[model samples]
Target: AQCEATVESNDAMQYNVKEIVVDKSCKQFTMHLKHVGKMAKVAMGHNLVLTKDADKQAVATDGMGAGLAQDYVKAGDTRVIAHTKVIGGGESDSVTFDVSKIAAGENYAYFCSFPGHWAMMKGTLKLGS
Candidate 1:
């Protein structure tokens, strides 16, 4: 069973992949986010926030007002399944979440909640057999 994987983010405010597969045997899952650019967090920060696909837009909007101190995520938001800390160039952050929280058949989404980054820096998350 897969326990972890690494994903890359670049200065262009883009994620290297559009989808991530979580193995069924994974009781707990982790995602490592690496920023391979030279930009500052204020300019090109990136983070991974996960939630049900239906909650993506709402969560992102709420996170926008939460600011950097909160990692652009709403405090104690139940909608957020898991998230990584915001990072800048050459930096990295990881987040671990319980697989139990994910339901089979439910569409999941992962995205960056850095202000306006959600529009493009996003991806799909699927549970694999």
Candidate 2:
């Protein structure tokens, strides 16, 4: 359970969990994102995108052109470590990433890539040392 975390997304431009803790012993980490409020993909869809803390805003901003089919993420974007698909209320998605890709003591961030939502629907994510 320590290797996996569940995150809830709502229509309020916020995430229920503010931080994600990845257990060091895990070879891979899984993050579950659930959209818990009523909304459409065009208006309030939520997705969990994992990237370096400094890349969050840029990744989200650049991803808008990719559209919903690409999960609001640019195709072949090497900066993304992992990401869940955009979803509406009652919908859910998950993303599993290799632990080896993470560097201990480095700052990381998880956020929604829904155009303007990243400004408010973002949080810190890190691997436990």
Cα-based lDDT for every prediction: 0.92, 0.90
Candidate 1, residue 22: how far the Cα is off, in Å: 0.8
- Residues 56-125, candidate 2, lDDT per residue (tens digit)? 8889988888999999999888999999989989799888889999988999999999888988988998
- Candidate 1: which stretches are off by over 4 Å? none
Best by lDDT: 1
Ten residues in sequence with the least summed lDDT for candidate 1: 1-10
Clashing pairs in 2: none
Stretches of candidate 2 off by over 4 Å are none
Per-candidate TM vs. native? Answer: 0.97, 0.96
**lDDT (Cα) of model 1:** 0.92
